[PDB]
Amino acid sequence: MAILNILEFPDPRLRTIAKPVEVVDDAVRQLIDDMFETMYEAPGIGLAATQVNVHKRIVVMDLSEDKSEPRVFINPEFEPLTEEMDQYQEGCLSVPGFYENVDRPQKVRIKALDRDGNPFEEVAEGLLAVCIQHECDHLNGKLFVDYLSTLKRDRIRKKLEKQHRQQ
Ligand SMILES: [Zn+2]
């Protein structure tokens, strides 16, 4: 069980497009367990493999307060089920410390493979709909600061670059 390093904006490796997982084997499940331990230790409720510099399409999440409901989505995809949008103040383990409003479709249908490689779908609303979209964006090399004004993003980017220099 390893705690992996989480890349942070503006590390260009966060812009890489993740490649699909072609077989869910024990190597993939071990990575998932390390991604869950990394996410729980952060702590965060969602983590995409791109963020730990593994460019494969795997997202782990656990939206509960007690770390009792882990969820795995491999080769996830979602499709909005409404044009209605909800605004949620998002944060991100790779943009630590910043939380900003992002509007996204309120309800979406996810399709993915589960921890055994079997395909399933799931309708998501609430925080699950926000999280799966945010995490699928990671696999496509997108971050939530990309939705913000360019001057806020630059201000966040400069703040983090400054912190990375001091660290
Ligand atoms: Zn994130």
Strand content: 25-35%
CATH topology: Peptide Deformylase
For the record, the CATH class is Alpha Beta
Radius of gyration: 15 Å
- Annotated CATH architecture: Alpha-Beta Complex
List the domain count as a whole number. 1
Main sheet makeup = 5 strands, antiparallel
Count of DSSP helices?
Answer: 3
Cα separation of the termini: 26 Å
Elements, N to C (H/E)? HEEEEEEEHH
The CATH superfamily label reads Peptide deformylase
Portion of residues within helices:
25-40%
Choose one word for the global shape: globular
Bound molecules: zinc ion
- Secondary-structure class: alpha+beta
Please report the total strand number as a whole number.
Answer: 7
Lateral strand order in the biggest sheet: 1-2-3-6-7
PDB class: hydrolase
Keywords: drug design, deformylation, hydrolase
Assembly: monomeric
Entry title: Crystal Structure of Peptide Deformylase from Pseudomonas aeruginosa
How is this structure best described in words?
It is built from three helices and seven strands, in the order αβββββββαα. The chain has 167 residues and is an alpha+beta fold. It has a single domain, classed as Peptide deformylase (Peptide Deformylase). A five-stranded antiparallel β-sheet has the order 1-2-3-6-7, with helices on both faces. A two-stranded antiparallel ribbon has the order 4-5. The site of zinc ion (ZN) has 5 residues, from helix 2. Removes the formyl group from the N-terminal Met of newly synthesized proteins. Requires at least a dipeptide for an efficient rate of reaction. N-terminal L-methionine is a prerequisite for activity but the enzyme has broad specificity at other positions. This is Peptide deformylase.
